Amino acid sequence: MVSFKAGINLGGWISQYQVFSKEHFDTFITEKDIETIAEAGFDHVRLPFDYPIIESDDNVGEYKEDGLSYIDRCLEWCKKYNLGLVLDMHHAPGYTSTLFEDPNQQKRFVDIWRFLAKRYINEREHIAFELLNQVVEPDSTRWNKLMLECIKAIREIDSTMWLYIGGNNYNSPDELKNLADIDDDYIVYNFHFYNPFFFTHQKAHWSESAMAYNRTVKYPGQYEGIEEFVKNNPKYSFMMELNNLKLNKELLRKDLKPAIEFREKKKCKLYCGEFGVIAIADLESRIKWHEDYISLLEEYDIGGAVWNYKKMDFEIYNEDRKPVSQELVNILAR
């Protein structure tokens, strides 16, 4: 029995890689990592991949066996340690995202999934597919169209492959209600969870509003100096609504509600593919958030995967495969 309830992400390997290099690809994640994860009690890993390791924009259609080898070996390592694997396309063709504008990008997208479905057709227990990681559109109309075509295409080849489908605006829990009705029994609905953003992403070097705010935040606790911050930076005036907001478990439960309600109606399976706290947050707060959040997922029977195994500013493990906090790993392995 393979399960997909308590996992961890493998970001930074064949997705969001620093430089496209074999050295990186061959050493960032090796079997020793999958073993560590397995010994820790996680039941699966989420593997984001960016299209270019599989297909080049020039000779569109020729799939690189050198890139695929990494996914293959990871599947082997997982099979060996009885872990599940959620293969996730993090960066699609064209997705300044032309994917929903250019039918050619759409064709390539579907073809890559058709290829993978065929390639792993004999693996029935250890792998699941996550079509597109985070969409950011005015509305769900175009993604719904692309998604339905992709599901259709995959079903022609594999009728029982579990597919993980997320909604608009970074797989937001309240955008699930805007997805097209997929009449299919092998679908799991995905949503990401990083609430409260200024706590989970405090001082995030890649977040302009978070870098501008440049404020340490505790949890439980509350946002401080928002009023004084907006005064100085009228550009982030929208942040005024977060003024003195109290961060606590009931706050987290309120943000999760949209997903819970969607499931009431669809009677479907939910999954939170990404959730976490930037590693520079004080340890006590960081542990407390995960404990509170994991607690809610347990309560509502939702599986998920914490961001991130190593590196990517959200590390759970040091580069020497030792956890940053053992109590944290225990909470996360459920």
Ligand X SMILES: OC[C@H]1O[C@@H](O[C@H]2[C@H](O)[C@@H](O)[C@H](O)O[C@@H]2CO)[C@H](O)[C@@H](O)[C@@H]1O
The token duo for 75 is 């599947």
- Pattern 136-175, ligand X, x by CB under 6 A: ----------------------------------x-----
Which residue, 11 or 158, has its beta carbon nearer to ligand X?
A: 11
Q: Where are the beta strands (DSSP E) in the chain?
A: 6-9, 44-50, 84-91, 127-130, 163-166, 187-193, 221-222, 246-247, 269-275, 303-306
Task: Return the range that interacts with ligand X (CB under 6 A); candidates 37-45, 72-80, 239-247, 307-315.
Answer: 307-315
- Label residue 207 exposed, middle or buried (CB < 10 Å: 0-12, 13-18, 19+): middle
Task: Return the range that interacts with ligand X (CB under 6 A); candidates 74-82, 249-257, 308-316, 320-328.
Answer: 308-316
Beta bridge partners of 193: 275
Which residue, 35 or 313, has its beta carbon nearer to ligand X?
A: 313
User: Nearest 10 degrees: CA dihedral of 65, 70, 71, 76?
Assistant: 110
- Pick the binder of ligand X from 42, 129, 223, 314 (CB under 6 A): 314
Task: Return the range that interacts with ligand X (CB under 6 A); candidates 92-100, 160-168, 279-287, 306-314.
Answer: 306-314
Q: Closest by alpha carbon to 192, among 209, 178, 176?
A: 176
- Pick the binder of ligand X from 296, 313, 321, 323 (CB under 6 A): 313
What distance in Å separates the CA atoms of residue 297 and residue 304, rounded to the nearest whole number?
Answer: 8
Q: Closest by alpha carbon to 331, among 288, 282, 301, 281?
A: 288
Which residue, 158 or 274, has its beta carbon nearer to ligand X?
A: 274
Q: Closest by alpha carbon to 296, among 259, 245, 323, 326?
A: 259
Task: Return the range that interacts with ligand X (CB under 6 A); candidates 216-224, 231-239, 288-296, 311-319.
Answer: 311-319
Q: Does 130 bind ligand X (CB under 6 A)?
A: no
What distance in Å separates the CA atoms of residue 291 and residue 328, rounded to the nearest whole number?
Answer: 8
Q: Does 195 bind ligand X (CB under 6 A)?
A: no
Q: Does 28 bind ligand X (CB under 6 A)?
A: no
Q: Does 198 bind ligand X (CB under 6 A)?
A: no
Q: Does 312 bind ligand X (CB under 6 A)?
A: yes
Q: Does 206 bind ligand X (CB under 6 A)?
A: yes
Q: Does 274 bind ligand X (CB under 6 A)?
A: yes
Would you tell me which residues interact with ligand X (CB under 6 A)?
A: 11, 16, 133-134, 170, 206, 274, 307, 312-314
